[PDB]
Swiss-Prot record, chain A:
One of its GO terms (molecular function) is dipeptidyl-peptidase activity. This is Dipeptidyl peptidase 9. Keywords: Acetylation, Aminopeptidase, Cytoplasm, Disease variant, Hydrolase, Nucleus, Protease, Serine protease. Val-boroPro binds at S659. The active site is at S659 (charge relay system), D737 (charge relay system), H769 (charge relay system). One of its GO terms (biological process) is pyroptotic inflammatory response. It comes from Homo sapiens. PANTHER family: DIPEPTIDYL PEPTIDASE 9, PROTEASE FAMILY S9B,C DIPEPTIDYL-PEPTIDASE IV-RELATED. It catalyses: Release of an N-terminal dipeptide, Xaa-Yaa-|-Zaa-, from a polypeptide, preferentially when Yaa is Pro, provided Zaa is neither Pro nor hydroxyproline. The lineage of its organism: Eukaryota, Metazoa, Chordata, Craniata, Vertebrata. Inhibited by the serine proteinase inhibitor 4-(2-aminoethyl)benzenesulphonyl fluoride (AEBSF), and by di-isopropylfluorophosphate. Inhibited by Val-boroPro (Talabostat, PT-100), a non-selective inhibitor, which triggers pyroptosis in monocytes and macrophages. Val-boroPro inhibits activity by binding to the active site, mimicking a substrate-bound state, thereby displacing the C-terminal fragment of NLRP1, leading to activation of the NLRP1 inflammasome.
UniProtKB/Swiss-Prot annotation, chain B:
The active site is at S648 (charge relay system), D726 (charge relay system), H758 (charge relay system). The gene is DPP9. It catalyses: Release of an N-terminal dipeptide, Xaa-Yaa-|-Zaa-, from a polypeptide, preferentially when Yaa is Pro, provided Zaa is neither Pro nor hydroxyproline. Its EC number is 3.4.14.5. This is Dipeptidyl peptidase 9. SUPFAM superfamilies: alpha/beta-Hydrolases, DPP6 N-terminal domain-like. Changing L62E: Reduced interaction with NLRP1 without affecting the peptidase activity.
Amino acid sequence: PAARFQVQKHSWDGLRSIIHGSRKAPHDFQFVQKTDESGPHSHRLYYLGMPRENSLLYSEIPKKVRKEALLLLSWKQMITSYDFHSESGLFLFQASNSLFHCRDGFMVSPMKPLEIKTQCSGPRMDPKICPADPAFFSFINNSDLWVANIETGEERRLTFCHQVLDDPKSAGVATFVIQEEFDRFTGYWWCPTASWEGSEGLKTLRILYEEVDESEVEVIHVPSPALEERKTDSYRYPRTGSKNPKIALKLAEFQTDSQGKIVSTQEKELVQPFSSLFPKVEYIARAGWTRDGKYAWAMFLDRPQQWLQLVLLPPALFIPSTENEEQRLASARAVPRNVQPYVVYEEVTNVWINVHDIFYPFPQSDELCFLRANECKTGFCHLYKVTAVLKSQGYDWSEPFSPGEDEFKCPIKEEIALTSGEWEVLARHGSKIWVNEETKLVYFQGTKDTPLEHHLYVVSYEAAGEIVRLTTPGFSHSCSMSQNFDMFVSHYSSVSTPPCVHVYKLSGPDDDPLHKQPRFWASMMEAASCPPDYVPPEIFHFHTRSDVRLYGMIYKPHALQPGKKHPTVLFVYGGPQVQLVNNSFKGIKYLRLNTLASLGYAVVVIDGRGSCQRGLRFEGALKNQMGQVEIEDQVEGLQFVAEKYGFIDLSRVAIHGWSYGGFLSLMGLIHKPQVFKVAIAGAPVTVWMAYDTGYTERYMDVPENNQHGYEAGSVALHVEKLPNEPNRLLILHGFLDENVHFFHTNFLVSQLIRAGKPYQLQIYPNERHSIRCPESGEHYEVTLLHFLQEYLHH
Amino acid sequence: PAARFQVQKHSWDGLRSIIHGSRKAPHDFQFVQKTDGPHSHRLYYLGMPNSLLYSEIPKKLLLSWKQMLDITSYDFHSESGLFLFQASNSLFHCRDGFMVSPMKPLEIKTQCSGPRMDPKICPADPAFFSFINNSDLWVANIETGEERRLTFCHQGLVLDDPKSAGVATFVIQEEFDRFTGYWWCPTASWLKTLRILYEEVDESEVEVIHVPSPALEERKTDSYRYPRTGSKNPKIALKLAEFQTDSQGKIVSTQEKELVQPFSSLFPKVEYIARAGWTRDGKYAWAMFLDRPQQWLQLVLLPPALFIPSTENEEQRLASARAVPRNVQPYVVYEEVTNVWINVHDIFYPFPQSDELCFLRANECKTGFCHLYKVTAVLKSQGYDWSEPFSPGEDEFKCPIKEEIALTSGEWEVLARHGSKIWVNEETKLVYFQGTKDTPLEHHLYVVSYEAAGEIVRLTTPGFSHSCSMSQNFDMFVSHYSSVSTPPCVHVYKLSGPDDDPLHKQPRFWASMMEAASCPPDYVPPEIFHFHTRSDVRLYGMIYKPHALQPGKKHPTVLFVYGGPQVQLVNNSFKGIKYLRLNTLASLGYAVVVIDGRGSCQRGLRFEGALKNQMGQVEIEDQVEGLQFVAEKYGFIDLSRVAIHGWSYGGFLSLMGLIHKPQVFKVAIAGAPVTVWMAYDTGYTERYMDVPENNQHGYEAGSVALHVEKLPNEPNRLLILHGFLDENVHFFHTNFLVSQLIRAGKPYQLQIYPNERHSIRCPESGEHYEVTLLHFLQEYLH
C-alpha cells in the first residue's frame, strides 16, 4: 500500500541548491624542548595546518596547566611536506616552485623564508637535509640526484643517468608502480653518520639510491591536464604480466673540507651486479640505514610478492663504477673477503606479503638486534625482537658466482614475540613505532581493543609483558610521539563526534615508566559544529552463514516513521587495503551518504571479506577470485540490515561505488540483477589484464597462471549479463585518471555496444581518480540524487 | 485536446528488433573500344556482390558483371591496357588481347618497409610507375622490378622528421580535397628523362595534437599536425624529380630540382597549393595558388627550364642560375578575386599550342555563379636575370587576357567541386558538363560548343538527379541516376544521329547495368517543397510524412539538420540508403523535416555567403521559418514537441537551436559537435569565419561552449553523441563542452563511440546509435 516511501522529487536547480546547501586539521608534528627554565613554556609544537590554504605554524606548551579548565593553543605563523634538523633547528621545505629555509634562538613572530638559489633547470623535487652535516641538503632535478650547501651556496650533480622515451634511466626517483601500490615516494637515503676515510683531511658523506631503467616497460598515453593544448603525457606503466623496471641499489660518496666546500664526488656500483647477487628480487619495497651507518639496508620482494627479505649492504661492498673491465677487477680484488651482504629476516607466505614500515635495528656492541613487524608468522601483524648472527663465510669478489637458495641467510639467535592475539599492530599506511632505549619501552598503535578503533599502546622490548593503552576508548586515534617521550598528540574522532587534536603529558614516577598516566594537557582543535542535517551512521555487526563476523554501518533515513519501507543506496568499495566501517567521523569524507539519508534514502555500508584490519586470512578470501566472493557478503549484509532495521524496501536497492567499488557495482548488477535495480559505477576496473603489476599480480597471480580468474572477474568480458533494460547503469569516470585509465570505461562502452546493452555515461574532463574541484563534486552529487530520484523504483 | 499523437512506446529489445528490421553501386567507369566483332566497347568499373569488374557492350536488357581478378581506386593506361591498384596493403597489375575468363592479379615485389600509398603509372612510358613510402617519392619498373627513391625528406625516427615529399597534408586533404602531392609529366625528352612535379613540405612549426589509436588495447595515441585557425600552416614548395632511363629500362640517373628563385620569393602571399598538374604536351607544369584568406586565387604555369638542380655548392647553383634563360618565366594565366571566399573548382582544360594559350576554366567569382569560360592568355616573356636574387609582387607574372568568352550563364551552376569534371571533344569542338541549369534539386548532363556560346542541349531525362561519365571517344556515356521515390539505376546511353550535327546527337538508351532494387518494404519516400522567407528568398525542404497518417492528429517532429557550407541535403535523389533512419523515424509516427537554409551549397556564392563571419546566427532562423511553414502546409506538426538532431555542423546547430530557440526545440541530440571554432583548423574556419585576431566577436558568438549558461536547467533536453577517434572534430569539443556544462551546473547525457571516427562505419555502433536516438525521443520528447 502506502508501505513504500517515495522520495520528494525535486527540480534540477532544487537538487543543486540541496547539494550547495550541505557545504556550509593540523598534522606533520615535530616536538622540541625549550631548555630556558626561567620562562613560561616547556616545549614547542611545529606542524602544518590551514588557518583556507596549508602553511607552517608553531604552538607553545606551558609548564603549568590551567588545572580544572580546558586550554586551547594559538596557531602562530612563521607546503605539503617539510624536513627538519632538531640538533640545529633548521627547516627545509619545497614551497611555490623552489626550495626555502629558516632557523629556530626561539623566534617571537614570523621570520621571512630565505630562498635557496639554483642554476639547475626545472623544479627541485624531494628535498632532504643531510643528517650528518646540516650545512648540506639533497634534491632530485630531471630524474637525477643533486647535493647542495645552503651556507656557501654550492650545488653539485651526483648521478648522470638522464639529460624522452630515449632516456629510460634515472637515479634517486621512485618509479610509478612503487609510488601507487607500494607507497614509497623516494629512491635515495642519507647515511646518518659521516666517516673520515683516507689518510689526511676531508669528511666522507654517503647516499644510498635506486638506479632504474624503464626501457622494456610498456608506454601508455594519458591526456594532458591543459585540455586546450590537446596533448598527452607518456607513462612507464607496466600491465600485469609485462616487464617492471630493471633496478639496482647504488652508493654516492662525496668528500668535503673543514671550510665546508665539496672536493670529490663519486658514483659506486655493487661489486657484483644487483641482479646477480639477488636473482628473483623484483621490487625494492623500502630502504634506509642503521643508526651508526655501519650497514645500509633494503626490503626486496619477489615478483609473485610471496617472499620478502630484509638485507644489509655494508658500504665496503660498493666499488667505484667505471666501464674499464680492467679497472673494475682491481677495486673488486681490493674488497676484503670478510665484507658481505647479510640476509637477516625472511617472510614467506601462501597468500601475499603486505609491506610493513616497522624496522628498528639496535646499535651493536658480532650480532645484530632489531624490531620487525611480521603478519606472515601468525596471520596477524605483531612486533618481534629478532637477534641475527652476522658470520662472514669469506667470499672471493674478483671471480663471479651464482648464490644458492639461502646464500646470505643469517642464523637467527633469538626471535621474541612482543605482541600476539587476533588483532594487529598498525604497520602500513604511514603508521610508525617509537622506541625509547632509556626505558626499553616501544610505543605502537593497534586494533588490540577493537578493529573499529586505532589506539596507542606501550610494551617493553626486554620483557614481552603488560601492554598499556594510552588513548581513551570509544574513539579511533592517529598519534604522534615526542622524541623525549614526555608528551604525545592524538588526532582522534568517532562516528558521532568530529575530530579533535589534544596534547597529552605522560606523567608519574620515573622508576615505573611503563605505567606513566596519559594526563590531558592542552587542546589544538575542538570538535567543529556538526553539519545542520548530519545524523551519524550506526555501526552494527552480523555473522555470515559460514560463522565469520562482518561489521557494517547504516545511515538511518532522517525523520523515520516506522512501518515505511525506504529505497536503499548500498555504498561499496569491498577491495583490499581499505576499511570503510570503523568508529571515526565520516562526515568530511562522506556527507553525500548523509545528504542521501536526509532525502529519505537508506545508505548501507558493509566491510565484506577481503578488507584491511582483520589480519591476513581475512584479506586472503580474495586470492585469485576478485568479484566472485565480495558481492555475496554485500547481499547477506544488506539482507541482515532488512531484518534488524525494518525500513529497507529490498525492491529498490541501488549499488554505487568508486574504483574497486565501481568494479563491484557492475559485478553486483551482473551476478545479482534481481537484487540491485540500478548500478552507479565510478572509475571502474572493467579488465584486469589492463591494470598494473604491483597491485594485480599480488592478488590475482599473472594472467598465464590465473586465466579462469582474470576472465571471470573482468566485467567487460561478461557484458552480455548486464541489463536489457535502460536506466539500470550509470558510469562516472575522470578522463585524466592515471590509476584506472579511462580506457576501462571506453572498453566497457565498446563491449556494451557489441552486446546491444543500454547505458548512461558521465565524464569529468579535468578530474582524475579523486574529484578535487568543488564544481565537479557538486555536479557528481546532483547527478547521483537526480538519477536515483527518477530511476530507483519498481 | 486529445489530438496530440503519442508514439507507441517500445521495450529496448523491442526498439533493437525494429532497427535490425530496418537494415535488410558501381563507380569509376573506363571505356575501351574493341575495334573489330559481336561486342563494340567494354566498360571497366568497380562494384560488390569491392573490386575490378567489366561489362561487354554489344553492337546491337541488363548487362553481365564479369570479373577480371581471381580495392578503392585504380590507374589505367589505354595504350598498353595496364591496370595498377592497391589491393591488400600490396600493389597488383594486369593487362587488357581481350580476355574471356578471369586472369590472376600479378603482384609487385618491394625493398620498402611500410606501405606503397598513392600509386600512379607514368603516362609517357607504362613500364614505369610511382608511389609514396615513408613520405618520400619512389619510382619502380613493372617489367624489371628495379625500384629507386627520388626525394630524401625522411629519416627513420617522429616530430624530429617534419619534412616530406609527394604527400597531401591534413588541411589539404580534409578542407581542399586534394589527396596527392605529385603529378607525372605526360611526355618524355631525349636515353630519355621523365619528370615529376611534387610538393616538398615542412610541418616543423605546425602545432602537434595527439589522438587515440584504433587499437584501444595498446592505449597509445597517434600524433597529427593539426594547425588551428590563427596558427602556422605547413611551409610548402613545388619541386621537379627528373630521372634518365636507357633503352633496357634501367634508371641511370635521378635529380632533385628546386626553382631558381625560392618559392616564397617568386609567389609571396601564396599559403596553399589547391591543385597542380601539366599541359597535355608536358610543355608547362601548372598550379592553383590560394592566399591564407582564400579570397585570392591564381592559376600559374611553371616551365621546367625554370627548375635548377639542388646543390649545397652556392657557386655551382649560381652557374645554373645563369644557365636558365631570361625568356623562361612563370605565367599567371588567371586570377579570381572576391570579398566573400574562393571556392576551389577542378575544371581547367588548356588547349595545346604550337605566345597564345587557350583554356577552359570554371569561374564562380565573376557573376556569382560557377560557369565555363574560354580564356585566351598572352604568354609574353618579359626577360629576367635569375642569377640576381629579386622579390616580385602581385601582378609581375600577370598575363594579358586576349579573349574571355562565357560558354554558360544563368542563376544556376556548372558542377566543378569534389571531383566533378568536364569532357572536351576537340574534334566536334563541344564541351560536355554537369549542371543545375534545369533545377537545383537535379544534377543533369549538358553539352555546349566551346567555339560559340550557343544552344546548351540537355542529355539526361528530367525527374532524376544524374552522375555521368563520357566514353573517351564521345560515342557513349553511363548515368548513375536516382530520385526521391526511385532507387538508383545505372543506364548506358549511345549518342546516335548525323555526324554533321554533333551538338544535337540524341542520347538513345542502349543497355542497363543496375536496376532500382526494391525499397525496404516499410519505405515511404519524402516529398520536396519550397517556401519564401520574410526576405522573399526561396528555400527548399524535404519532409518524411508520418506513416499511416490520420488527418487531424498533430505528430511529434524531429528537425534533422546540417546547415553547414559545402552541403545540400534537399534535392531529387534517393535518400533511403544513407538516411534510412529518417524513414524509420517516420515509420514510428514522428514527422521528420529537413531544410537547406542559407549557407548551403548549389545556389551560388551570395546564398552561401550569408554565413560569412556569423556561423550559428543566420542558420537557425531559416530552420524555424521552414518548420513553421511545414506545420501550416502539412497539418500534422505538433510544434510543442520538436526535437533537433545533426552531426558535425548539425551537432553545432542543434546546440545553437536549443540556446537561441528553447521555446521551439524541447530537446537537442548533438552528434560530433563543433563546440569551439577557435579549436578547429585554418582551412575551414579562416575561409568562412576570418581569423580570431580579426573576427573576435563572431568566433565567441558561434562557440556553443562559451554560451553554456544559456543551455537547459531541465535534464533530458540535451544528448551528446561523439566518436572517440574523431580526427576532423576531435572529442576535445565534447570534452570542453562537458567541462563548461559542469561549471554552469547544467545536466547532459553522453554517448561515446570508442571505435568510430567522424562517421559511424561499424554496423553495431550504427544500430546502437539508432536505438538510443529512438529510446531518447520515446521517453523525453513529451
